[PDB]
Amino acid sequence: MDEFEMIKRNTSEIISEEELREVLKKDEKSALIGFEPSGKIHLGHYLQIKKMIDLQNAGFDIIILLADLHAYLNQKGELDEIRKIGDYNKKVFEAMGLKAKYVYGSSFQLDKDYTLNVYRLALKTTLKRARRSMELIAREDENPKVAEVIYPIMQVNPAHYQGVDVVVGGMEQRKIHMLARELLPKKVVCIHNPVLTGLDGEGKMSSSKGNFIAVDDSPEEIRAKIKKAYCPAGVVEGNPIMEIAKYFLEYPLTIKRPEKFGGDLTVNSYEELESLFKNKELHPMDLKNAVAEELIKILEPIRKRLL
Ligand SMILES: N[C@@H](Cc1ccc2ccccc2c1)C(=O)O
């Protein structure tokens, strides 16, 4: 893959690919991602950090916004607590091999000019649109709060995009990103990552929902987690184990199997893995065993580096 294709790889969308190519032509390029700090850093975060590392390899300076105040607004707790979690998060991303600069939302998001821009952009953003943009982001709430519609206008604040060529996030961010693209002086390139399915398989992988593999989980816990994971034969859609195989595993992948169930297998691409599986020629147990073991290896230097 040339640089663009390495960046494109495993992304759900790039807005736009022709803005991206324009950016690649510059020397100094910078890419931002923001995270509500999470108590556990899981494969969902790792997917995104891997993409930040792609960009880093392509010569981008990486900025990570530790979005404590957004996390406050999105009901994840008190600010001082969210900040400590953010410092943990920082440690985990650095363990992953990302070389980035880290900015804490609270350090600038209470400045008068920032706030004035929250208010300015609240006048330009409808309630309907704001609520729409948060459908995939908002904390579950029977009685949705005003905080919910403040969150996306804050996320579109020009201070976040000053000097940044590209913003990265999951597909759940896309409506907020489209709003920024409409409201800011400068259109920033959006690169969107896919959103991982939970181990249990209903919704998406989340720290607050107990359906995650944390990058620091021990080998034992990773096995037990992937043991109980949802993963039907021939069913590639919403299968977290196949997602793990697609997004984390290096190919060719040598799957282990007893001789009495076809013997050890080699798949030279995720494409090959997918057909073998969708043809009901690779059973869940065998895929599960192979994903658990390759994951442990993948994660080992991160978990050990975290000690
Ligand atoms: N909304 C994100 C956090 C988040 C908050 C503010 C941002 C500002 C600019 C670019 C990305 C940003 C991501 C989350 O769901 O974790």
Curated annotation (Swiss-Prot):
A motif ('HIGH' region) lies at residues 37-45. Residues 228-231, 283-288 are annotated as: Interaction with t-RNA. It catalyses: tRNA(Tyr) + L-tyrosine + ATP = L-tyrosyl-tRNA(Tyr) + AMP + diphosphate + H(+). Its main location: cytoplasm. CDD domains: TyrRS_core (cd00805). It is found in: Cytoplasm. The record marks 143 as: Interaction with t-RNA. One of its GO terms (biological process) is tyrosyl-tRNA aminoacylation. GO terms for molecular function: ATP binding; tyrosine-tRNA ligase activity. Homodimer. Catalyzes the attachment of tyrosine to tRNA(Tyr) in a two-step reaction: tyrosine is first activated by ATP to form Tyr-AMP and then transferred to the acceptor end of tRNA(Tyr). This is Tyrosine--tRNA ligase. It comes from Methanocaldococcus jannaschii (strain ATCC 43067 / DSM 2661 / JAL-1 / JCM 10045 / NBRC 100440).
